[PDB]
């Protein structure tokens, strides 16, 4: 398969596109939270929270 | 008719009627491909990162 030869470039593209799809995954729920990425998010940005 | 009642002919007519359902509908659109190998073999990707 002429996509899996250059194993650095292929895994780099999976690494960036996993940063992106966990970025909006934890964007509906941030909660501050050092383990969660540092976002505050939208579960408490659209409620009666502070 | 005591004459020619034992010497008649028994011809049929040209009326064969097909009574069986011999059809290939789903086979008729699968985009048939040739293959000269023991087994088709490809790769399936999962997640993990």
PDB file of C-alpha atoms in Angstrom:
ATOM      1  CA  UNK A   1       0.000   0.000   0.000  1.00  0.00           C
ATOM      2  CA  UNK A   2       1.507   3.301  -1.130  1.00  0.00           C
ATOM      3  CA  UNK A   3       0.374   5.170   1.989  1.00  0.00           C
ATOM      4  CA  UNK A   4       2.024   3.080   4.707  1.00  0.00           C
ATOM      5  CA  UNK A   5       5.574   3.171   3.342  1.00  0.00           C
ATOM      6  CA  UNK A   6       6.593   6.462   4.915  1.00  0.00           C
ATOM      7  CA  UNK A   7       5.701   5.479   8.463  1.00  0.00           C
ATOM      8  CA  UNK A   8       6.753   8.812   9.980  1.00  0.00           C
ATOM      9  CA  UNK A   9       4.518  10.898   7.714  1.00  0.00           C
ATOM     10  CA  UNK A  10       1.524   8.559   8.015  1.00  0.00           C
ATOM     11  CA  UNK A  11       1.604   8.398  11.818  1.00  0.00           C
ATOM     12  CA  UNK A  12       2.157  12.160  12.024  1.00  0.00           C
ATOM     13  CA  UNK A  13      -1.087  12.668  10.108  1.00  0.00           C
ATOM     14  CA  UNK A  14      -2.919  10.300  12.446  1.00  0.00           C
ATOM     15  CA  UNK A  15      -1.390  12.127  15.409  1.00  0.00           C
ATOM     16  CA  UNK A  16      -2.599  15.562  14.304  1.00  0.00           C
ATOM     17  CA  UNK A  17      -6.056  14.278  13.344  1.00  0.00           C
ATOM     18  CA  UNK A  18      -6.363  12.665  16.774  1.00  0.00           C
ATOM     19  CA  UNK A  19      -5.517  15.968  18.462  1.00  0.00           C
ATOM     20  CA  UNK A  20      -8.323  17.514  16.413  1.00  0.00           C
ATOM     21  CA  UNK A  21     -11.004  14.903  17.048  1.00  0.00           C
ATOM     22  CA  UNK A  22     -10.357  14.910  20.788  1.00  0.00           C
ATOM     23  CA  UNK A  23     -10.312  18.698  20.779  1.00  0.00           C
ATOM     24  CA  UNK A  24     -13.962  19.103  19.882  1.00  0.00           C
ATOM     25  CA  UNK A  25     -14.743  15.936  21.822  1.00  0.00           C
ATOM     26  CA  UNK A  26     -13.668  17.685  25.033  1.00  0.00           C
ATOM     27  CA  UNK A  27     -15.087  21.013  23.849  1.00  0.00           C
ATOM     28  CA  UNK A  28     -18.681  20.193  24.752  1.00  0.00           C
ATOM     29  CA  UNK A  29     -17.382  19.410  28.264  1.00  0.00           C
ATOM     30  CA  UNK A  30     -14.239  21.185  29.438  1.00  0.00           C
ATOM     31  CA  UNK A  31     -14.667  21.734  33.203  1.00  0.00           C
ATOM     32  CA  UNK A  32     -11.243  23.359  33.571  1.00  0.00           C
ATOM     33  CA  UNK A  33      -9.563  20.144  34.538  1.00  0.00           C
ATOM     34  CA  UNK A  34      -5.784  19.771  33.847  1.00  0.00           C
ATOM     35  CA  UNK A  35      -6.407  16.202  32.628  1.00  0.00           C
ATOM     36  CA  UNK A  36      -9.083  17.355  30.169  1.00  0.00           C
ATOM     37  CA  UNK A  37      -6.978  19.715  28.081  1.00  0.00           C
ATOM     38  CA  UNK A  38      -7.462  23.009  29.859  1.00  0.00           C
ATOM     39  CA  UNK A  39     -10.713  24.063  28.224  1.00  0.00           C
ATOM     40  CA  UNK A  40     -13.742  25.321  30.085  1.00  0.00           C
ATOM     41  CA  UNK A  41     -15.915  24.127  27.250  1.00  0.00           C
ATOM     42  CA  UNK A  42     -19.655  24.333  26.653  1.00  0.00           C
ATOM     43  CA  UNK A  43     -21.339  22.144  29.293  1.00  0.00           C
ATOM     44  CA  UNK A  44     -20.859  25.036  31.729  1.00  0.00           C
ATOM     45  CA  UNK A  45     -20.614  27.887  29.228  1.00  0.00           C
ATOM     46  CA  UNK A  46     -24.324  27.502  28.377  1.00  0.00           C
ATOM     47  CA  UNK A  47     -25.893  26.881  31.776  1.00  0.00           C
ATOM     48  CA  UNK A  48     -26.398  28.605  35.113  1.00  0.00           C
ATOM     49  CA  UNK A  49     -22.790  28.053  36.150  1.00  0.00           C
ATOM     50  CA  UNK A  50     -20.270  30.833  36.756  1.00  0.00           C
TER      51      UNK A  50
ATOM     52  CA  UNK B   1     -65.215 -44.320 -38.425  1.00  0.00           C
ATOM     53  CA  UNK B   2     -64.231 -47.988 -38.634  1.00  0.00           C
ATOM     54  CA  UNK B   3     -61.719 -47.006 -41.281  1.00  0.00           C
ATOM     55  CA  UNK B   4     -58.858 -44.621 -40.345  1.00  0.00           C
ATOM     56  CA  UNK B   5     -59.452 -44.594 -36.597  1.00  0.00           C
ATOM     57  CA  UNK B   6     -56.338 -46.662 -35.875  1.00  0.00           C
ATOM     58  CA  UNK B   7     -54.021 -44.732 -38.190  1.00  0.00           C
ATOM     59  CA  UNK B   8     -54.376 -41.122 -37.030  1.00  0.00           C
ATOM     60  CA  UNK B   9     -51.508 -38.732 -36.368  1.00  0.00           C
ATOM     61  CA  UNK B  10     -50.765 -37.135 -32.992  1.00  0.00           C
ATOM     62  CA  UNK B  11     -48.987 -33.909 -33.875  1.00  0.00           C
ATOM     63  CA  UNK B  12     -48.596 -31.212 -31.226  1.00  0.00           C
ATOM     64  CA  UNK B  13     -48.555 -27.438 -31.718  1.00  0.00           C
ATOM     65  CA  UNK B  14     -45.830 -24.797 -31.401  1.00  0.00           C
ATOM     66  CA  UNK B  15     -46.857 -23.821 -27.901  1.00  0.00           C
ATOM     67  CA  UNK B  16     -44.188 -24.582 -25.319  1.00  0.00           C
ATOM     68  CA  UNK B  17     -44.840 -22.447 -22.242  1.00  0.00           C
ATOM     69  CA  UNK B  18     -42.038 -21.734 -19.780  1.00  0.00           C
ATOM     70  CA  UNK B  19     -43.183 -22.462 -16.224  1.00  0.00           C
ATOM     71  CA  UNK B  20     -39.998 -22.061 -14.165  1.00  0.00           C
ATOM     72  CA  UNK B  21     -38.581 -18.967 -12.459  1.00  0.00           C
ATOM     73  CA  UNK B  22     -34.972 -18.896 -13.663  1.00  0.00           C
ATOM     74  CA  UNK B  23     -33.789 -15.338 -13.029  1.00  0.00           C
ATOM     75  CA  UNK B  24     -30.616 -13.588 -11.844  1.00  0.00           C
ATOM     76  CA  UNK B  25     -31.358 -10.096 -10.545  1.00  0.00           C
ATOM     77  CA  UNK B  26     -28.815  -9.561  -7.760  1.00  0.00           C
ATOM     78  CA  UNK B  27     -26.077 -11.278  -9.762  1.00  0.00           C
ATOM     79  CA  UNK B  28     -26.903  -8.974 -12.665  1.00  0.00           C
ATOM     80  CA  UNK B  29     -25.432  -5.832 -11.095  1.00  0.00           C
ATOM     81  CA  UNK B  30     -22.417  -6.811  -8.956  1.00  0.00           C
ATOM     82  CA  UNK B  31     -19.771  -5.451 -11.430  1.00  0.00           C
ATOM     83  CA  UNK B  32     -18.104  -8.787 -12.170  1.00  0.00           C
ATOM     84  CA  UNK B  33     -14.283  -8.865 -11.897  1.00  0.00           C
ATOM     85  CA  UNK B  34     -11.698 -11.518 -12.847  1.00  0.00           C
ATOM     86  CA  UNK B  35      -9.134 -12.974 -10.466  1.00  0.00           C
ATOM     87  CA  UNK B  36      -6.064 -15.184 -10.952  1.00  0.00           C
ATOM     88  CA  UNK B  37      -4.882 -15.863  -7.394  1.00  0.00           C
ATOM     89  CA  UNK B  38      -5.635 -18.155  -4.476  1.00  0.00           C
ATOM     90  CA  UNK B  39      -7.420 -15.530  -2.345  1.00  0.00           C
ATOM     91  CA  UNK B  40      -8.284 -11.829  -2.455  1.00  0.00           C
ATOM     92  CA  UNK B  41      -6.467 -10.184   0.420  1.00  0.00           C
ATOM     93  CA  UNK B  42      -6.586  -6.559   1.563  1.00  0.00           C
ATOM     94  CA  UNK B  43      -6.091  -4.490   4.719  1.00  0.00           C
ATOM     95  CA  UNK B  44      -8.610  -3.134   7.230  1.00  0.00           C
ATOM     96  CA  UNK B  45      -7.719  -0.201   9.473  1.00  0.00           C
ATOM     97  CA  UNK B  46      -8.830   0.348  13.069  1.00  0.00           C
ATOM     98  CA  UNK B  47      -8.055   3.059  15.607  1.00  0.00           C
ATOM     99  CA  UNK B  48      -5.605   3.212  18.465  1.00  0.00           C
ATOM    100  CA  UNK B  49      -3.958   6.630  18.731  1.00  0.00           C
TER     101      UNK B  49
END
